[PDB]
Every structure is written in C-alpha cells, then in structure tokens.
Amino acid sequence: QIEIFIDGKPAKVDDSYTIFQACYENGVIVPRFCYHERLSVAGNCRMCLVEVENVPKPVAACASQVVPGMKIKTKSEKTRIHRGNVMEFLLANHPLDCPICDQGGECDLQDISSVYGYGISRYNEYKRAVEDKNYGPLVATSMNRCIHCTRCVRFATQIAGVEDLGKTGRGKAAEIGTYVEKTFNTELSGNVVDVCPVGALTNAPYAFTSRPWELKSFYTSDVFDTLGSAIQVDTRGPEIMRVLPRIHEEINEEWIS
Amino acid sequence: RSYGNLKDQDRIFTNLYRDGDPFVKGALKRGDWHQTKEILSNGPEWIIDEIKKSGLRGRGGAGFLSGLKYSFMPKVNPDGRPSYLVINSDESEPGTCKDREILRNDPHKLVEGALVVGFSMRARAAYIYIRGEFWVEANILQQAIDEAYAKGFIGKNACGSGYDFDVYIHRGAGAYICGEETGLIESIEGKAGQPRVKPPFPANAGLYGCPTTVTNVETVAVCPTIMRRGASWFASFGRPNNAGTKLYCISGHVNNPCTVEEEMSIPLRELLEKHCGGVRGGWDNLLAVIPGGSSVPMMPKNVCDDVLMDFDALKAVGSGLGTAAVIVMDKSTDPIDAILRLSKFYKHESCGQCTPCREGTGWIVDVMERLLVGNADYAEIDMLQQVTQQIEMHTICALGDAAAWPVQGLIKNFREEIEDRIDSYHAKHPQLKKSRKSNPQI
Amino acid sequence: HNIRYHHEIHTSDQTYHSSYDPVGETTTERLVRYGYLNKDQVNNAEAVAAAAKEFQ
Amino acid sequence: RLAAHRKNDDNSDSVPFEFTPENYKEIEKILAKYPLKQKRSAVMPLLYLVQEQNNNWVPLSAMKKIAKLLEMPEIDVYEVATFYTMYNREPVGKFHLQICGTTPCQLCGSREITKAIEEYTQTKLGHTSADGKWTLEEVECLGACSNAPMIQVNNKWVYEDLTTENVVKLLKDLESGTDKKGPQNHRNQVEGPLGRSTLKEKDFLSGEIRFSRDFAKAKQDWVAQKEQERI
Amino acid sequence: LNPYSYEALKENHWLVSDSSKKNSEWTHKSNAEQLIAKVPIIYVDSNIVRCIGGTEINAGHPQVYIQLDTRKHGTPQTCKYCGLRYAKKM
Amino acid sequence: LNKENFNRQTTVLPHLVLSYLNKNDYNLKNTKNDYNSMEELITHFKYWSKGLKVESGYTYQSV
C-alpha cells in the first residue's frame, strides 16, 4: 500500500502494481498494443510510454512497477510528443489497406492514431512488403499489417499450448509466423484473431461480409458444448453475422472453442 | 602534468606484439598465474575494495566503475542458486580490434582475471562469449583453458584454495546486438538474443534467472595485474576519475594504423604523431576523428586539435571514449558517405524487437541515401535531426542511441557541406513539378 | 516535413463557475446549515465564536 | 536473406540427416558444458557441428534433429538459425568470400578490392558463380580494423592488408591451397607498418617478469584501517 | 480437378473455385472477373512492386507495395485493389 | 507584367492571405492526401465511417 500521483490527484495502490494497472484502476486510459491482461508482459511496442518526473527517459507503463511517491503525467506535452513519435514509427511501414481491411471500424491502430497521434505523415519512401501465409480455412493472413506485437506468439505458447508460432529473422525484415508451410490447426485457433490488434490475422469465414457499425449485439450462452460459454451474437437484420466470446471468469474465462 | 610517454615497464600486455609464446609456458615466463593462491587467500571483500580503490572503469564502451558494479552482486543466495560471471568477448563495434589482440596474445591473463573476479563475487562458473568471427582466437583461448585445467589452476582445487571454478567458452554467431548484456544472456540461453526490459537488472535476475554480471575482456585481463602491482600503481596513471592505462586501436587514413597501450587522458594529437606516424598528408589534411566506436559522434578538427583521450574530456566536447577506437579521416573523405555506411551498419544489426529502432534505422538510411546525392530539401536535414531525437531515448536498449548519435554529429559538423551538395544537385537538375508519389527505390 | 504542431495546443474550452449562498441568510443560519452549530446553542457567544473559528 | 524456408527439392523433409559418432561425442561434451535443465543452451554449438559436417550449411532436417535432441520446439531452432547471419540455410559455394565494407575498411579501399574480386571471379558482390566455386558476399566489421582492408573465408580464415593485385594473388593461392594466413604483406599481426613504436625494450621482455606483494600484510592493514575508522 | 477437393480448396484460399468464371455475372452482377483474367502477368525486375492503379495519384487506388520475393520463385501476386498480377522477372 | 505567370490573367488570388500566414498548413494540405499517406487515410476512414468526435458540452450560436 503506497501513495502515488496521477496527473496531480493522489491515489493509493499496492506495491506490486504496474503503472498501467494503477492508471486503469484510477480511471486513466493509456494506449497500448502489445500488453494483454492474460499474457506475459512484453515491452516491444512503445505506445504506453508515459512521462515521470526525475526520470529522464519515458517509462513504459505496462512493464514498470510503481514507486512510492512517484508522479505520472499522462496529460503533459511530453507524453503527447512521445505518443506521436511512437505512432509515427508504427505507421511508417503500415499499408494503405483500411478500405480492404476487415479491422476497419474496430482497429485499435486507427482509434489510437486518431486520438493520440500527430495526425499527418512525412514518410515518403517504399514500405516493406510481406508475402502472405496459409494457416487454414479459419484464419486469413495479411502480413503487411503486422506490427510485430508478439500477442499471437504469446497466446499460442501460453494459452493454446501449441508451439508452432514464432518470430524468424532480424531487424525490419523479420517475419511473424511458422518457418515452414504449416496450418494453424488447433481448437481455440480463431481466438488468436481476437488477440491480434490489426488486420494481420482475420476471421476467414467472416471475410469481407460485414462492418462493425452495421451490427446489433446480443448476450447469450452456447450449447455446442456442455460448458455454457458466455457469447455475444452480432447480427444484421434477420441474418446472424458472427459470434464473439465474453468475459465470465467462472466459465471459459475469455475464450471460446 | 603532461599525460603520456609511458614506460615499457608499466605495460600490462607485454605480449601484444607476439614477442613470446602465448601459452602456459610463456604465460609463466611473463609472470601470469603468480601468487594467485595468495590473492585467493584474502577475502572477496578485500578484492572488491582493491578494485574500487584502483579506479578501474569499464572498457566496454560505458565507463562505469568496475569495483562498485561488482559489489552490486549479492553476497549469499538463500535459494541455493549459483552465480555466473560472463566475459563479453564479443566485439562487433566498428573501429575496435583490441580484445582480439588480447585473446590471441594473452589468454592466460583473461583466465586468471576471470578466476579472480569470480572469486570476488562468489561465482561458480565463467562463460566467455566470443563472436563467431574470432575462430582462431576462440581456438587459442580454448587451448589456454585446457592448459589451465591440466595445470590445476581452475576447477576442483583451483590454485589449491578450496574454491570450484569452471571456465567455459560459448561461441556466438554473427550479431552485433549480442554484445548487449541482456541480449548476450538471451543468446546464451538458446534464444535469438534480444535485449530484455530493465529493471530487473542482471545483478538480481540474469542468466537462467540467477544473479549474473557482464564485463569486458580488458577489465578482467587487467584485474590480476592490478591486484599484484597494487591499486596505487594503476591510479598513478591518467587524470583523476580516469585512472589506469588504456588500449588504443587506430585505423583509417593514418600513416601507421596499429594497436598500442598508453596512459589514459593522453592528448589525441600527441598520440597520433607519437605512435601512428601522423595523419596522412599532415595535421592540416585532417578532416574529422571518431574518438571511440562508431556509436560515439564524430569530432571536427577544431576540438581535435586540443582534446585529450579519456571519458570526461571527450564527453565535454560532445563525444565519448567508448572502446578507445580512433578513426582518422582526410580531406579526400566524404563525411556523408562514411556516416551513410555507418547507418547502413546500424540498420542491419538492429534486432527488430522494439518499434522506434526497427523503423528509424531504415528511415535514416533511406534519408541519408538521398542526402548523399543531393536529391533532397533543406528541411530534410532538420527532419533527420528530429527523427534521430525521436529514435533515441525511446527504445528498449541503448542501440537506438548508438544509431542516432553519428547522424547528429554529422549534421552538427557539416550542415554546410550537406547544403552545398543539395544546392549543386538542384542547380544542375531543374525541376518544377513535385511528385505526389513515394521516392524511387535505391 | 514539420508535423509536430498540426494540432492545436491551446483551445477555447475554458468554463468558469460561481456559487453563492442565499443573500438573506444570516450568519447563524449559515453556521447551523453547514454543520458547525446546532439549534440549541444559538444565542450563546461562546458557541457562535467557536462555530465562526471552525468555519474560518 | 529471406526469413523463411524456400521451397527446394534438395532441402525437403525427405532429405536425410544424421550426426557422426565423433559429432555425437562432441554433442555429449557440449551438453556437459551446460546445466542439466538447460540443454537448449546447446542449440548454437550443435548448429555449428551440422555446418561442419554438411558442407558449410544447415539443412531443415538437421534443425529438426537438433530440436528432437534438445527436447525443444522446432520453432525455437528455426528462430535461432534465422536470427544469426553466420548460419547458412542454403547450400553455398566452395569458397565463401566475406568482404568487409564497414567505414574503417571502406576508408582503406574496400570497394576497390571488392571490384578486383568481382573482375577476377566473374561473380557479382552478392552472388554465387555458375560453377559454384565462389560466393561473394559483403559483411560488416570483422574486428580487424587496424589491418584493413580485410576479408574472411568460410567463416574460418581471415586475410588482411589487401591491394588490387595482392587480393588476386590471394585468390589464386586459395584456389591452389598454398595461401598465407594473416596479413598479405610484411606486416606482423597488429603492429603497424614501418616497424613498431612501443615495447622497444627487450631485456625486460625476454627474461622472467615478476611482481611480488605481501597480501597478508595488505589484509591486516585493510582490516586495521577499517576497524579504526569504524571506531 | 474437383473444386471441393482438398488440393483445389487449399490452393484457392479455401474457397470453391470457378474456372469458367461465369458464375459471377449472376452472383456478383458483372463480368469483371473475366475482363481482369484477360490481362496477362506483368514481370518486374526488382523484388518489390508499387501499384496505384493508374498514371497519377488520386486516379486509381492508394499506393500499395507487393512483395515478389516468394518462398517459391516466381509465384505471381495479385493487387488487392485492382486485379493486376505481377511476378519477378525470371 | 508577367508573361507566363497565372497572375497575368487577373489580379485576384484567393489563396494569397492563406499561403502568406499558414504556410505550413498550406504545404501539408497540398502534398498529402488519403492516397499517399497512412495517417490521412485513417483520418478519411474514421471521418466518413463514424464522424468526428465532439467533447461534451453545451453551446448556443446565432447568426
């Protein structure tokens, strides 16, 4: 139990918290791409960088523990500059794919850019291009959109229990996926799509058919297995369009088969 | 006093020019492995205090105080887990070629220093991380370690002091990022070798989750001689807070490129026209000098005429000692071309783990390629400065700063040259319409 | 090539609020309503002074 | 190099691989070098062993065999073999020339010697010859900046101080196998040309060198002084 | 070959194929598939190609970059905005 | 008088004030659109799919 400061308002947290956890519990939203509440902590992206006094370098909120008496300034101009720089680097090599990307309308990259980025670009060179891989009829791949966030690798290793995904190569030319031509065959495979923040991995049956804003959602439970998985059904008119998992923490945690 | 002009008696590496057998026979003839039992008889705290009083600082390109850093290691492990000492024999910093000479000429010095330091920190084993390009050096060091086992200096009754110490060689493949300590540990643990997020630091959790420390070859190799000679002898050389001798490797546009050992805080010009035969074409023909590795920003002649070669002196002028690598450039050198090649080096050696480095290295290379030919704008220099300032100090490890610094130095020292190149290109190449498309691939 | 200040830093979004007590309210009513006094200890100098200091 | 497995008829799953008994003894020694629970740490050495016994490149089947041997997933072996540029994942020519191109070697004429090698071997800077004898590739700094420009062969042997004609002579010697290691001129290892400038004394450098200290008295002085200052 | 077979589905992004391409005048109400199939493959010298679907910016589609360095040498790739197909020259 | 310049045709230049003061914004708007910039394409998509976001508050404006 230690006292910290977030934008001038004193708060009390536990000494085991990270800055991101304290900010979220105190109602402060910090942008993120690689941190997930159920996977291991990675610090590869840098969108969660915040500004703290007496610490010259920006500190990653998700991968740094709180210090008694520290002050986090998420509304300073320095934090805005940090977020703008990171967003600029993230979008330097991103493809102009939003009209054809199934993530449009619910992409975290789009919303984070709109809210926190500088709002305009200056990169005027060729972007990298990546050939697409085949993972099976459930997962569609567009690997030009990947930001190397490692969420899929961590999900496959730590949640699904399969060891087929990884990162091969070095530098800007490194690629995420299997080294050889191998399908991503497993139960809970489609869940990896929900983990990936960009349109790099998409729901292959749910390809091009719908957009997020033209759907109505209902909460219900599944009957395909005797675990009553809490699910969300998204429909457009008289047609059911997709099924997503919910949060229960006593059934299915976050995941569906 | 005027620093420099060191006597031959005060050299530590007397085998640097191969004047004797590098193996155990020559090592004993040169005084290695002498009175090591008496050194190990004293407590580790005494060794720590002697290293602290000697004033030895890290030779790996940082300059941290070795004694305090070694003292950071824990004194006891309640879990029963061991402690590891790691020798950073990887050397991929451009311009630096000293540890190769140490390994291929004085391996037993490295082994003795490893034993002494590991005993000082109560470490079980020592892992020496040699780059794969040092095949011959790895073989020579392995033969020296085999001789040390055969003579009963390390392992089981190491020097007859009751301490167990094993020395192992881990040969790593081609990767500059493997010189970074956490990346080095990850490389040892059967992984790619990407740097970790600190904290935690290796003093708490390092190799295999056990406490670990990573240190350069030179400091380890000079520790036993310091212990035998004494802290005062080492501190008697160089400026305050810059004590001891230093190995300088000089290459490029100099008359006599070579590796020498000299008292620290030596004047730069005095060093060049004492040991390296002077700049090609004379001192007036000098254009720029890189005082340390390629990470350190380049210097113009104005400060090179007077600056000394040490940590504080080079830091006060906007540079650093780094790994004591000296690169000399003539008036026939194109600074833009050299810095572009350095940026291309840094682009290829990024591990790609974290965003700012992974994109900014390529962006810097792409901008510098157009800057070289003049097909750019006056505002692109400021854009490059801002891009470097965005890359640096935002990444996981310190490689992003090492990639940002040389371009900043080049801009600060030859903005006028860059502008002249751009002006000539635009004067010889009229163009009215501006393309809305991306720049052509180079 | 300058993009850092494409978005406005200072904007005209400031709001200012004023809150006043009733004009006809006396000192004793203000002290009682604010939980610094009770109706019984009215018309007593010590209670009024203590409530005034506590309020101040 | 591509960060993926290229489809090759001679590099498929049907391609056999098996360690030699001498390589098996080397494997058990390497595994003895590491803790019992950290067998995966031996992935980098074993890869070299493969590259030793299979013509300087590492096939996919060898990587699968290493993964099975070390009880680690194949994807980790893939990541290790792809991260490091010193491992060849495709067959390579008889003489793999790795010309240094970093700025210290560039200032000494790396481009000129590269052009000389190009015009002799009839093979471009990043290419393998038609007959397969030569594979020219450009690499970063090789830690021999003082003896620049310099090249390396087969990740084994380094040759320094090359000129336009000396590199041609070195290539001919490598073809005939009668080459000279180290510098290609009178230079003696790292000491510069025109002789040396330091370590001139020889009486001290040819006899027994000793430096004796009384560590017992040193320790007694240290304990006495720390106790005195603590009191 | 059976369009519902494993190989045909696997080499068609797990979709039922149509070699005649004449199902799309009813399902998609046009003959664009035939017309785009009438365009041959463009062979590019470099490893990457840039498509904008026209001679100038804003006349076509946003700039996209297509990789031609494939796992199998010379495998053609399709632009995802316009149907043009490219391959690395030899 | 100029011979080939556009100012020869007429004396009215409806962009002279805007280009004089807001040169930086004039340059960015005239060089980057949603066909060659990622940020601008994201802005276009969000603008035409969900619209701009307006901070909560009350206003009254008369003309």
Ligand SMILES: Cc1cc2nc3c(=O)[nH]c(=O)nc-3n(C[C@H](O)[C@H](O)[C@H](O)COP(=O)(O)O)c2cc1C
């Ligand atoms: C990108 C990078 C590369 C490095 N390369 C080396 C190297 O080749 N050798 C070395 O001794 N230290 C290298 N270092 C420094 C080490 O991380 C570490 O600071 C040093 O080994 C500490 O030892 P010292 O106290 O003896 O200097 C590098 C650091 C970075 C960030």
Ligand code: SF4
């Ligand atoms: S993943 Fe898709 S919607 Fe998201 S910003 Fe990138 S291209 Fe646009």
Ligand code: SF4
């Ligand atoms: S394919 Fe997507 S989820 Fe996977 S690592 Fe890449 S960006 Fe993250």
Ligand code: SF4
């Ligand atoms: S700064 Fe570069 S080298 Fe260091 S962790 Fe990030 S990507 Fe890797």
Ligand code: FES
């Ligand atoms: S969310 Fe913290 S570094 Fe990625």
Ligand code: FES
């Ligand atoms: S630059 Fe070539 S060996 Fe260092």
Ligand SMILES: [Zn+2]
């Ligand atoms: Zn197109």
